Amino acid sequence: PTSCNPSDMSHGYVTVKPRVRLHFVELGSGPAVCLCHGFPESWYSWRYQIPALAQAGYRVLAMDMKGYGESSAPPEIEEYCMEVLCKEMVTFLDKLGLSQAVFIGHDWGGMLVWYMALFYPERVRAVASLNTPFIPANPNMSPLESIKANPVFDYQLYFQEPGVAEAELEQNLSRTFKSLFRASDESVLSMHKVCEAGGLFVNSPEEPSLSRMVTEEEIQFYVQQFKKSGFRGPLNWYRNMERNWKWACKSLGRKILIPALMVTAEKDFVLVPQMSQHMEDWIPHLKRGHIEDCGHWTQMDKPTEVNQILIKWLDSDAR
Amino acid sequence: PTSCNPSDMSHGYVTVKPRVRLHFVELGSGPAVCLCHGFPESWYSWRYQIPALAQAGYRVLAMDMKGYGESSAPPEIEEYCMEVLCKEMVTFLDKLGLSQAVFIGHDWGGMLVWYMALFYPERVRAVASLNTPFIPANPNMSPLESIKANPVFDYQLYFQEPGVAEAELEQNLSRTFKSLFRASDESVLSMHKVCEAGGLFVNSPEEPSLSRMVTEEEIQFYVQQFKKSGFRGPLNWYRNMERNWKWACKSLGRKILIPALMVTAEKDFVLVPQMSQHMEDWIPHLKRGHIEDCGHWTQMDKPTEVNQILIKWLDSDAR
Ligand SMILES: CC(C)S(=O)(=O)N1CCC2(CC1)C[C@@H](NC(=O)NCc1ccc(OC(F)(F)F)cc1)CCO2
Ligand SMILES: CC(C)S(=O)(=O)N1CCC2(CC1)C[C@@H](NC(=O)NCc1ccc(OC(F)(F)F)cc1)CCO2
């Protein structure tokens, strides 16, 4: 599928708070579709969807989420709690003069768009998530208890203390992205052993090979983007579990009534498809897509199937 | 009518040539409407139309034209001939993934949008001009002969030699804009005496009064914008008469077949309404608006009537 050259894009910037500007890339005309990437990615992670959605008749806005790329990275950890992140996206729509938009997120971005749909339905024409399920807050179980209970979420403890994971992620950026951005069968990391081994990469190659998903050029674009602000801002998305839990609890009971799509990936061994199994009980108009042979990096793993699922669903439920 | 605060706008940038980026402001959703200002103005000159068109259901893109504000100002004089300016606007639409757009221009911007409609009809959904008529190139009359024949176009000779008018326009920017941006009854300049007096402002106040059209704050925004690149780039729009004439001649015969609106201003004593009198012969689907008591600075002189004329015409002919 057609990709993107970063230098031939239209670049947009919106100030949503005194020292916070969000950067995005924009392509196409039609209903506005906002794309929200995950950790540790970029607007560029949508490079295969952006020209496809625009050719299908949508106005695509691919964010650099806060902390990333050309968007501002404020230093304070609580600037990255879901409550602030969602209220900034609303301000983003306001400054763009958009009454509502389709939100499509992946990974942490999928988490963000669920909470946009939950707390700002009036601003969300429709919502889609890749990999990230919507699980309502359990008011009787803390986030720390919910982690220790999924041995695969163990890496999020290693991510907690400011400075620690930054050092490993930033020490050889090309090694970081070559190690993360891989198909499931090429994976060199065990997220369920990270905290005792002492790090994400302690037991993976010094000079890793290039995954079949990515080129050296695409790797170097991510490298150059993260040289700007580093990994602190991105890592701060994990450092607000208690705040996010408390805020999510304030919503308990209410359903998401807008058109919705959950896309699961067969080989995502962190965000496994079964974690989505009862979303219907909370989201009554929910439709589904499922992609076989697809790992965590869904947009670049299986871009053609992602494009088909998204365009089919936008044409029938968002328009 | 609602105006614009510059700091609360979404700002967009598109690279159309190696060292040429165009900056624009963007507001709203719906069919794309591109607004092209005149000399010596700014995207901000549309401050009263931008929120009004967006509230009426259009996606507004207000350009900083080349040479102005935050858009690039290349040093070469022939970078500002209509042929290059129009081909850059086409590239602008391309990089934004827009098949076509409504073009609305004023003054030199109105000249630009006529030639867009003439040479790129396929990219222009509809075209509107304020004040600037469309006169087909006369192949048997040079631009210099056509000027000397309108004594009111005399100031364009003073604008020809690089450096000369720059010095007068840039010597006291606040005096420049306070002297230009006035209602017709408050006007302090005689454009038909400029070349013998030796300058635009030689016979007008040292500290001019503030016109009823503008605030001191709005004046200071124009001042700060023109401090960036000065008046060379803007003045170069007048320094390509022979090139523009030759290029315009290459089109002779052909009509403009797309939906079109010509808005004339009763008190514009340079671009007088009668200069538009036979545009119907070349533009068969042409509709008209006319605004009484309105001078050259139409958008800020009579913003409510401009908004009414434009929204009425967009709803019936552009949509
Ligand atoms: C569970 C609670 C603690 S939670 O409710 O707080 N909660 C839910 C789970 C959670 C966090 C918050 C995961 C977030 N995403 C990532 O962390 N992505 C990193 C990553 C990297 C590499 C990789 O590669 C592979 F291992 F090969 F697959 C896979 C994943 C998205 C939002 O949600
Ligand atoms: C005629 C040929 C030589 S031409 O074919 O080459 N040609 C047509 C005429 C022409 C130029 C090219 C005028 C251009 N606009 C201006 O120059 N605006 C400046 C201005 C400033 C102050 C002011 O204030 C007032 F006097 F009080 F009213 C009025 C106007 C737009 C494009 O077209």
Ligand SMILES: [Mg+2]
């Ligand atoms: Mg159920």
Ligand SMILES: [Mg+2]
């Ligand atoms: Mg006639």
